[PDB]
From Swiss-Prot, chain A:
Disulfide bonds: none annotated. It comes from the Bacteria. It is an enzyme of class 4 (lyase). Industrial production of acrylamide is now being developed using some of these enzymes. InterPro entries: CN_hydtase_beta-like_N, CN_hydtase_beta_C, CN_hydtase_beta_dom_C, Elect_transpt_acc-like_dom_sf, Nitrile_hydratase_bsu. GO terms for molecular function: nitrile hydratase activity; transition metal ion binding. Keywords: Lyase. It holds the Pfam family NHase_beta_N. It catalyses: an aliphatic primary amide = an aliphatic nitrile + H2O. Heterotetramer of two alpha and two beta chains. This is Cobalt-containing nitrile hydratase subunit beta. Gene3D superfamilies: 2.30.30.50, Nitrile hydratase, beta subunit (1.10.472.20).
Swiss-Prot record, chain B:
Keywords: Cobalt, Lyase, Metal-binding, Oxidation. It is an enzyme of class 4 (lyase). Its cofactor is Co(2+). The modification Cysteine sulfinic acid (-SO2H) is found at residue 110. Signal peptide: none annotated. This is Cobalt-containing nitrile hydratase subunit alpha. It catalyses: an aliphatic primary amide = an aliphatic nitrile + H2O. Belongs to the nitrile hydratase subunit alpha family. One of its GO terms (molecular function) is nitrile hydratase activity.
Length: 228, 203
């Protein structure tokens, strides 16, 4: 979609806040939010592309100014409700309970070792998105291509600043999960992936550095040939 | 930046804490989340996985031309030679800074960062201020925010990482380090230098 998270080229968001050194986790709640990612993934709440789509549907002012891991909480709840796995009424009741009793214990539960084994395997083994397809890549290094002007409302990785722009293919990476389907609940539908180079003048006009380019990843449907 | 509509940080943290604890309690009751699972993820990204791994890769590349060739040809396989790889770095491509080219990495659409070599990203990398501007005025941003002056004749390549392919910057080896040991060289490699927002440490 065309949401405020698509910030490339936006002005006026302010100076970078870079506090001289910071911890990995700024509060205990951030550790919980971070670790809910593998837990909700294993439980079928969402895949990685659906996860991002959930963040993209936040209130825009909340997205721009809230702590990063709060975005993750919002997407868990979004997919919890979507899959019927989270009852909102029970969530709101428990929230008030922990508002009023912040030191109350968590529910009794078994420390199932398979869940920790899952964490170790995911972390060190990875979750590769590369996929084999039968068809060869349509494009090759050096091809001049143009990026689609399509503006889907669902999930995509089509930053507004590259739509309709012309660039040169720099590398073919193989085929990967396609966000425009996976993030919208339509499956992996893998497509070949390329890096395409766009000059700063092509993207920004005369305000563009004559000695700078942006390299942007394009799945095959995003681009059409201009010159082989 | 001042927003007259915004609550205090203390009130925001109090509300988030309650909402997160409530959600946590529900996932625990569903049997899909446990406190031990949470503690393991925290321990890994606080202590086991961080930019010291990426620094090992960089120094090997600086000191082993054959390994550097493998690293630039297939970053994932080369890093696996050192036992480095996994979640959010399944596909890595390393790009080499030179006297004519400078590389900087961003994810304008979100926060994607090569965890197996750098750990979790610092907050500024995920935030809208860096993401919006670095694709539009990278030369001005590097100078004003990081004190890093890239001469206008030198090409800046901004890698906007929109897919699962993770781009990692191999910084140039600082002058004055001929014959240094791998441990001494690693002290000059920073996560910032592997993002491209700074060069490797001088001196």
């Amino acid at each position: 979609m065309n949401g405020v998270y698509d910030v490339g080229g936006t002005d006026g968001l302010g100076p970078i806040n870079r506090p001289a050194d910071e911890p990995v986790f700024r509060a205990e709640w951030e550790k919980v939010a971070f670790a809910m990612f593998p837990a909700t993934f294993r439980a079928g709440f969402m895949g990685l592309d659906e996860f991002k789509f959930g963040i993209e549907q936040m209130n825009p002012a909340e997205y721009l100014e809230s702590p990063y891991y709060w975005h993750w909480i919002r997407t868990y709840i979004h997919h919890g409700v979507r899959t019927g796995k989270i009852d909102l009424e029970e969530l709101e009741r428990r929230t008030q309970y922990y508002r009023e009793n912040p030191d109350a214990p968590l529910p009794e539960h078994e420390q199932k070792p398979e869940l920790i084994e899952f964490v170790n395997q995911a972390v060190y083994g990875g979750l590769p998105a590369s996929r084999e397809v039968d068809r060869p890549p349509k494009f090759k290094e050096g091809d001049v291509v143009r990026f689609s002007t399509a503006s889907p409302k669902g999930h995509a990785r089509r930053a507004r600043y590259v739509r309709g722009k012309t660039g040169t293919v720099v590398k073919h990476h193989g085929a990967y999960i396609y966000p425009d389907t996976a993030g919208n609940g339509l499956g992996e539908c893998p497509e070949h992936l390329y890096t395409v180079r766009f000059t700063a003048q092509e993207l920004w006009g005369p305000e563009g550095d004559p000695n700078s380019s942006v390299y942007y990843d394009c799945w095959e449907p995003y681009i059409e040939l201009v010159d082989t | 930046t001042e927003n007259i509509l915004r609550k205090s940080d203390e009130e925001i943290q109090k509300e988030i804490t309650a909402r997160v604890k409530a959600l946590e309690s529900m996932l625990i009751e569903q049997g899909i989340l446990t406190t031990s699972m949470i503690d393991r993820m925290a321990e890994i990204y606080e202590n086991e996985v961080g930019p010291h791994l990426g620094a090992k890769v960089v120094v090997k590349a600086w000191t082993d031309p054959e390994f550097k060739k493998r690293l630039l040809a297939d970053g994932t396989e080369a890093c696996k030679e050192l036992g480095i790889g996994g979640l959010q770095g399944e596909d890595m491509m390393w790009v080499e800074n030179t006297d004519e080219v400078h590389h900087v990495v961003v994810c304008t659409l979100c926060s994607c960062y090569p965890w197996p070599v750098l750990g979790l990203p610092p907050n500024w990398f995920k935030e809208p201020q860096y993401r919006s501007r670095v694709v539009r005025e990278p030369r001005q941003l590097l100078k004003e925010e990081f004190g890093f002056e890239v001469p206008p004749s030198k090409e800046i390549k901004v890698w906007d990482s929109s897919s699962e392919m993770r781009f990692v910057v191999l910084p140039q080896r600082p002058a004055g380090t001929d014959g240094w040991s791998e441990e001494e060289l690693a002290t000059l490699v920073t996560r910032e230098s592997m993002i491209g927002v700074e060069p490797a440490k001088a001196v």
